[PDB]
Structures are given as structure tokens and as C-alpha cells.
């Protein structure tokens, strides 16, 4: 009797699985060979491996038992088994969890507020907003704006720097309620978050 062996590329490199792979989806099919043409039993071992993946014992079909989340865990080492019902052969697979855009930007150092004088010249930068997005590429890449846009203030869309763009007036207005929007730039489903910025005016 000669022991069976896996032939899938991913035993030598890695298996890529999108984090939005739905529960129940088949992620792949283990392929193995046996010079005795024996029937073959496929399996998965590991506390962690078995909570995430199930293996059809007859067909080698691997399906997902639990949602993946790249931002929680971007890699697994998983152990697959194939048996010729005489000896058990185990072999490790590195799993890369592929990104989708599933996080909105996250503001930092809130609550946001600044006090400025009314004579504050046009152009003067008065505040820095900061939001991070953990997704990759366009989905992880933050743009800033006011919602709605301001007649009196502006925010650099790259850097989140708030400037004064028209002369203020204490006799007329003492406060400003201002909503900052931070969106990511995912092509199909951009996500966004909102923050208050409070601007007191002094004499």
C-alpha cells in the first residue's frame, strides 16, 4: 500500500478566501491521488480550523461554518487530512483573508471643538479632523467634507484641515454647529461616518 497525497496549488502557496464569503459557500475542493486507486476520506483538524471550516469526507469540498473578518484575523494556518482508510496524511495550508470594504471611517480625539477670535483672518487654519479606515486600497482611503458645505469654513479633503474662508462677526454669530463627513473611496459601496465640530467665537 502507497500513502495518498494532496495536489492542490494552495499547499505550496496559500488559499485566498474573501472575508465576505457567505456562511455555507464552498471555498475550494481538496484534490488527492493514490497509486492504488483507493477510495479517499478528507478531513480538517485544529480546534480553530474546525470552528471555521468543514470538509465533505467523500468529495473533499471545503465550506465555511463561520464569517471571516480580515480586520479581526487576516491569516489562518489550517490542517487538512486525507486517508486511504489505512494511513492518515495531514498537510498545512496558509489561508489569506481577502479584503472587502466593510468598515466606515473612525474619527479620533473627539469630541471636536475650538474657540477662535472674530478677527481670525481668511485662510487661517483653525482645526484638524482625523479619521482612519482599516479596509485596504480605495476602501481604506478617507475624504473629508462638511455636510452640508459651509459658506464660512472649508475642510481640505485629503488632510482634514479646517480653514476660515469668509470674515466672521461676533455681533451676528457666537457658535457654529458643523458636521464633518469622512467617506472612503470604494468604487461600488463607499461607507461614511459623521462628527460634530463646535466653533465658539470670542471678543
Q: Which residues bind K ion (CB under 5 A)?
A: 140
Judged by CB under 5 A, does residue 103 bind Ca ion?
A: yes
Cell of 83: 486517508
Using the minimum distance from each CB to Ca ion, give the nearer residue, 139 or 160: 139
Nearer to Ca ion, 102 or 156 (CB): 102
| Partner touching 15 among Ca ion, K ion, none, CB below 5 to 8 Å by kind | none
Q: Supply 57's cell numbers.
A: 469526507
Q: Are 112 and 150 in contact (CB under 8 A)?
A: no
- Of 34, 79, 118, 156, the one binding Ca ion by CB under 5 A: 34
Is residue 160 part of the contact set for Ca ion (CB under 5 A)? Answer: no
Q: Bridge partners of 164?
A: 153
User: Shortest CA distance to 110 belongs to which of 126, 131, 124?
Assistant: 131
Q: How far is CA 126 from CA 64, 131, 132, 194, in A?
A: 50, 17, 21, 19
Judged by CB under 5 A, how many residues of this single chain contact Ca ion?
15
Residues making contact with Ca ion (CB under 5 A)? 34, 36, 38, 69-71, 84, 99, 101-103, 133, 135, 139, 184
Amino acid at each position: 500500500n502507497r500513502l495518498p497525497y494532496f495536489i492542490n496549488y494552495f499547499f505550496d502557496t496559500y488559499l485566498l478566501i474573501s472575508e465576505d464569503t457567505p456562511v455555507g459557500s464552498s471555498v475550494t475542493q481538496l484534490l488527492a491521488r493514490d497509486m492504488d486507486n483507493d477510495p479517499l476520506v478528507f478531513g480538517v483538524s485544529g480546534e480553530e480550523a474546525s470552528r471555521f471550516f468543514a470538509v465533505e469526507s467523500e468529495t473533499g469540498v471545503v465550506w465555511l461554518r463561520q464569517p471571516l473578518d480580515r480586520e479581526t484575523k487576516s491569516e489562518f494556518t489550517v490542517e487538512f487530512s486525507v486517508s486511504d482508510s489505512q494511513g492518515v496524511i495531514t498537510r498545512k495550508v496558509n489561508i489569506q483573508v481577502g479584503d472587502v470594504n466593510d468598515n466606515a471611517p473612525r474619527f479620533h480625539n473627539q469630541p471636536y471643538s475650538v474657540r477662535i477670535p472674530e478677527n481670525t483672518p481668511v485662510g487661517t487654519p483653525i482645526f484638524i479632523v482625523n479619521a482612519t479606515d482599516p479596509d485596504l486600497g480605495a476602501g481604506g482611503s478617507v475624504l473629508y467634507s462638511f455636510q452640508p458645505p459651509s459658506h464660512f469654513f472649508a475642510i481640505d479633503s485629503g488632510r482634514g484641515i479646517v480653514t476660515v474662508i469668509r470674515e466672521l462677526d461676533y455681533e451676528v454669530t457666537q457658535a457654529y454647529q458643523l458636521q464633518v463627513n469622512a467617506t472612503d473611496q470604494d468604487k461600488t459601496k463607499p461607507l461614511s461616518t459623521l462628527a460634530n465640530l463646535a466653533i465658539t467665537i470670542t471678543d
